[PDB]
Amino acid sequence: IEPFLRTTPRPLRLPDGPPCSQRSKFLLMDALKLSIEDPSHEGEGIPLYDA
Amino acid sequence: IEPFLRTTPRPLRLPDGPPCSQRSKFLLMDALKLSIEDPSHEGEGIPLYDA
């Protein structure tokens, strides 16, 4: 058993290289939306005409 | 020339018979509406889908 002291743990060594790139399926914080208002008398509109 | 005094004119004689009936092409004072609101994105809606 080797004892685990307050000086034993070391930081994780992150790899080197060129910076990572986005891989999500859609934009997260850079997304821009075009918005419209749909009053009560709409129910469920076909996604194509909403676009 | 026969003079026209304040006792000469007589009221028009309206005809007799059963009471007259409506002949307008749409209801005037008995009409009822089914209404929907529209903001600004419904600009030129097809009259069939509005109905």
What does this structure look like?
Chains A, B: Belongs to the influenza viruses PA family. Chains A, B: Influenza RNA polymerase is composed of three subunits: PB1, PB2 and PA. Interacts (via C-terminus) with PB1 (via N-terminus). Chains A, B: It is found in: Host cytoplasm; Host nucleus. Chains A, B: This is Polymerase acidic protein. Chains A, B: It comes from Influenza A virus (A/Zhejiang/DTID-ZJU01/2013(H7N9)). This is part of a larger assembly, with two copies of chain A (51 residues). Chain A has 51 residues and is low in regular secondary structure. Chain A is 8% helix and 0% strand. The longest helix of chain A has 4 residues, at 47-50. The N and C termini of chain A lie far apart (65 Å). Chains A and B meet through loops of A and loops of B.
Q: Quick one: how many beta strands of chain A?
A: 0
Q: List the chains of the largest interface with their residue counts.
A: A-B, 4 and 4 residues
Proportion of residues in extended strands of chain A: under 5%
Number of helices of chain A: 1
Main beta-sheet strand count, sense and barrel state of chain A: none
Structural class designation of chain A: little secondary structure
Helix content of chain A: under 10%
The secondary-structure element order of chain A is: H
Rg of chain A (CA only)? 25 Å
Note the overall shape of chain A. Answer: elongated
Specify the oligomeric state: part of a larger assembly
Q: N-to-C terminal Cα separation of chain A, in Å? A: 65 Å
